[PDB]
Amino acid sequence: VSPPPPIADEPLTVNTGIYLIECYSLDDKAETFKVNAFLSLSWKDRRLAFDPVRSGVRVKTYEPEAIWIPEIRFVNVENARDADVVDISVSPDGTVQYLERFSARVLSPLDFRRYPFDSQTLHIYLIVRSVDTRNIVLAVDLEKVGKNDDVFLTGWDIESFTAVVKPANFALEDRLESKLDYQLRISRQYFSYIPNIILPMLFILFISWTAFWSTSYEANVTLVVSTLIAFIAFNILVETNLPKTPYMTYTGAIIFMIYLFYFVAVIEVTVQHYLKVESQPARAASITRASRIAFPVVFLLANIILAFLFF
Amino acid sequence: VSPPPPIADEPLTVNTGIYLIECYSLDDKAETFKVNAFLSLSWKDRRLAFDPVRSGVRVKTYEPEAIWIPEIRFVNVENARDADVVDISVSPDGTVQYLERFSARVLSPLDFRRYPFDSQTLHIYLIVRSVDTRNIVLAVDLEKVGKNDDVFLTGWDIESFTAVVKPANFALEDRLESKLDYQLRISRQYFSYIPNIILPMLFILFISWTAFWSTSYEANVTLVVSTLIAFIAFNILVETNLPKTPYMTYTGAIIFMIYLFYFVAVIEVTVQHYLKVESQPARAASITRASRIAFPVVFLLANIILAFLFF
Amino acid sequence: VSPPPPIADEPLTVNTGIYLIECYSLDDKAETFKVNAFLSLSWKDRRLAFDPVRSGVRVKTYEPEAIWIPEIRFVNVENARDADVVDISVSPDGTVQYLERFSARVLSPLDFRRYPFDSQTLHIYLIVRSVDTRNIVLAVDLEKVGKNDDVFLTGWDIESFTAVVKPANFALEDRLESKLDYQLRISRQYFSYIPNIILPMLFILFISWTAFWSTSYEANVTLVVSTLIAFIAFNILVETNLPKTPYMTYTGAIIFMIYLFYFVAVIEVTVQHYLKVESQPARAASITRASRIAFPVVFLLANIILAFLFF
Amino acid sequence: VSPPPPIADEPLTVNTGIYLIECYSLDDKAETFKVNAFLSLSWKDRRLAFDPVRSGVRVKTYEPEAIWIPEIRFVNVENARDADVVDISVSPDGTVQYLERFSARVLSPLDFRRYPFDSQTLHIYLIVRSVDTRNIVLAVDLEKVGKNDDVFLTGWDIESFTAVVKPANFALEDRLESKLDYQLRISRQYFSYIPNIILPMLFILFISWTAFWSTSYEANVTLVVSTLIAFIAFNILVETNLPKTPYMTYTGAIIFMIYLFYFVAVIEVTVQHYLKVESQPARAASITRASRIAFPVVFLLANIILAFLFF
Amino acid sequence: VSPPPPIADEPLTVNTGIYLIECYSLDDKAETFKVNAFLSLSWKDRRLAFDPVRSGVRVKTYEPEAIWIPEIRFVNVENARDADVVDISVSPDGTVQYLERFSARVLSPLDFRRYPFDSQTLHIYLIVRSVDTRNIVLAVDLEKVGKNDDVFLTGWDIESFTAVVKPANFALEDRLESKLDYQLRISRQYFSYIPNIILPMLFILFISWTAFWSTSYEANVTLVVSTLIAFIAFNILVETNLPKTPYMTYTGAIIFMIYLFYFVAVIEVTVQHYLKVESQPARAASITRASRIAFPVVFLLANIILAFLFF
């Protein structure tokens, strides 16, 4: 089987369509997601054209081996997709209507900078390498691009499944390659975060601020240091939820800031005690009294500054 | 092999049945469960009809390659099922009786809101795509829908295995599809949780309440803060058992409330000390005395409120 | 290939035998184990009978495709076994000596109630579905049921590999099914437990009992609460070894009891302090003095009760 | 199919080229990385030569089964690559132009001594075993050696993808083997480290140094020991990020040094207290006063020494 | 294809050779290791002999399907090896020279008693089952037994790759089987251990010994108990490195001893305080003074006894 010949010198148009059946296994660390979808393909092969009246049939059904089918691959997959041809149908003019059900693990980069208020665009790149006899170009049949209503991705709101109609045609290793960008838009379900992550983390930090209404150095050391341990322990507890990024994230910055605050609170506690011990309790008391306002205010201000920088 | 032709214009009825052999690997995080079962299929193909008299046989046995078999797939599977044809049997009228043993990893969403007193409905969706020559419709042979008595799912009580008789017929990618909902009802085995999770978690919270029979600020800071660490550590210890939900769960609400109580207990401890230090021990003593009743009562009340809201 | 025909109306006997080559991956949580073994099958097919004198051969060797072989499956496997036919041999009478090497992941429930002094019976259920032409029944050739001496399962003592000779013949989906129970008996290697789990866990509890020879409420709060943290931390450390059971285990009950003891020790510590503070040190001292004997005695008593209930 | 025969006694030159499509799953522990790339092969097999005039085509396309293709393997792969032949193109001289898309898990050792400021050279070794009829030698077509601009490896900066043109020809098991070294140069994205790992780890160590402005042995024991716990807990928190090396890493030497500092700080705290208790507070005060400068200075010096030794 | 016939009644000798290409994934817990190697096989089949003069060629190349090849399997593999036939070569006398490249996950037990100063012998057991027509016996061609110099196993020093020349012949399931033991000797790279595991673990224990230069019961309780927590936390931190053995290991014994020492140190701390409180400070002081020497001495001694006991 050879490709259909051009009437003039025109490229072959392969009309594509992806319909999402199942969407699962979004791995935040691996930046991969698993997909189970239909891949629809369409092209004209005049060599397959028939007279419906003499044939008695409106449509002819073929086996994949029997006819020429374009070699469509995905760019951003781990291994080649597991595909099962559902149907091949030929109409009198030689139009081929191909359909297969496939499962694939797709590599799509994720941006955690706005976590947990982040939205993501998942990419599925379709590609075709042109042959010596003729050039092959990809196209999008928007009527054949969809997703099952039941498609769920735990922790995310599935916004849209679309395709960038204009293919990316380019040369690679002395041949033409026509690329298609299919986009799955998702946004994170940030509710649970507040009572599960933020709130208990703020309570632990607020407990260390009680050292500003105490003069007992022993009680203060216990308050600041024991809360620091509790904070680390709490982080270990929530660790699963927070992401491992090589860059600086919003939640990541807040966490860093909380660590800085434990350090500054220690300095205060240490300073207050040294002044008291070095017989200047008026200064010690003024610093502690100031800290009572300074700490929440500077925290609230710095949080506003961060939120602004990230959004 | 082409599909059997219609006598008039009627669709082909494929009588289905699923008999559960093994049920295992219910992954609470992935919302997947592995199944090992029999899939029974039955349809009429008159091209296979024979006279039992001139043949001498009551039944004819065929190889899957030899005859036409409908392309039945599952909707909510990760990859296509691993199937092995057990038997194909044609009765004289041309009625085919297909049987295969298959294993599949099924995606079924789970609702953790009532954990660990939650019940779940696991779905197995059967599907058939209609062809150009004829429409195919799925049906349920209730005598062929069952489950092995030995079917076990560690941590769950297997209630029922049933099917929604009326198929969901709809159009997809320009062709008809007939869908069947098979339901596996399971309810959780919540015993262990009381002595394993709830009770030790209540003991740690009760230890913090002893700060209401103490005046030593140092001892009180140690009681409240060290129990807070112990609580977090205990949560890390039970972490495996509790589920990672993007929404608010019953167990998760209790946990949040316990965090709030540690914060309020700190406020009390802090207030009691400030009043004492600021020379008003009568108020400090009244607050501590009240807390002794207030804390258990408010706890018991808010737990009743929560239980009521969730159940 | 069709099944061998019956002389009268008798069922076909398939003589089975499993010889364990390798045993590995016993997953305590999944209740699965991986197996690599030989499966031997034997039956008489008179159509295959030959004259050794004219043939010059004592035995004829066939390819699996060439002759009829019974469809033997395992009930409690995840997916169908990976089998490789080692040999097929026919003797002049038509006796078939089949042999294959297979690997499979077996689902066998485990009972953790007596952990770490538990023994288990692993099941491998062989099955054959009868055909329309004749009934098939399984049998056990005990000379062909064994296990390699080198078979090891880390942490267990491999007791025996046997089969329940009497098959379980029953009806399923309108046909006869003959089932065989192969049993692998294993018992746990509980040595390490004592120095690794029990002993350090008892030492931490005993440290908390030193609060009965102290009057310092601050030192006592530190002893009881810090040991409670240490206990939880130790549990997190050993967590890998202990099992996640939905029911009550022996080891599990001891752990619960240890949590109760930390709570009672807190009550004592709290009571002793309140009496002292409320100017009744004679009562406080009597309670503490009693606790010194009460705590070890009640602990020892309850453990005896627990051991008795579980064994 | 046998190899093409030599015109004289010359070896067959196979011109190779690898073009990186996707780069993912760099496992720091396993020292493996997953790759999805094009493998281009080119050789002359005159047996395939054709007259374009008689054939009516300028280039002939073949199926892999139809012609002889060299047995190219990778040395450092886990299992054999998953390859899919994209195109086989024969020009009239008999020049074959092969192309396949493959995915493979490549084993390449990593050097963590300079982590997180480490750079790595990933190797992909191409190999061909010579046959009895003629010798096969590998070559590099540099125009066919590249990488997609979109190639990303989370946490790394992809420097270059090159090949050592000169093959490593050697004898193995009585036959010639021609080896090619393809090199992927990567350098780590160390930003996040500072606010994520170092900074909070330095703050915890600095908190322990406050014991040099305190005389309370109880407060000092709490400062040193509680910070030590906090440090260990923090290490458990960052454990995922730091690597498990059998040798000494730069980050690892810093961590070891931090442990030594907690030990020396304990000695000081212990010494200061013993001198005070043994009625020599002048010495105790001088040691503590010195420590205030000694500890940061010695730390800063030893970190400079470490950095120097590693870089 | 049948096996080559014997000239007299002699068995067929299959000359084997394994050449290690890659060695990876040594799983200390699973006691498995992955291996990528060449398997060379050689035997004489006179039915494949040819007159070099009449034939024209000295070596006849065959496809695996074309000739008889002995069924060689590995005993201690999880599933059957992934093999790819590299070459089949028949000399004029009928001497077959087989070569395949295979990858397999091999089960080999490990002995952790001397960890981290352990050495291991990894086994790869080759096996052949004899047939009805002829007995098959394995042999070792030592010139074909080797390993690539680049073979690395992170954390281990690869000592040797050898084979026990004398096969283990025995009967199994009524037939003869010839077994070959190939041995890979490895020894652990124990450097990192000292600064990573031992040293920080000794520092934490030494901190607890400072309680012997203190009289403050509160400071002592804090020293002993807080270090005990730190020790457990440190163990959780290093847990990945240490192995899960059902038997007593050297490291495991040291760890147990360290737990005993924390318990004895508590007793001392408790005793010292009781004597002081019960008005006998002379005894309390003598015990504490003795402990200062007793604890390090008894520790150092018990370690020599342990070291000797294990080596």
Ligand SMILES: [Cl-]
């Ligand atoms: Cl693909």
Ligand SMILES: [Cl-]
């Ligand atoms: Cl399916």
Ligand SMILES: [Cl-]
């Ligand atoms: Cl099976």
Ligand SMILES: [Cl-]
């Ligand atoms: Cl390869």
Ligand SMILES: [Cl-]
């Ligand atoms: Cl094998």
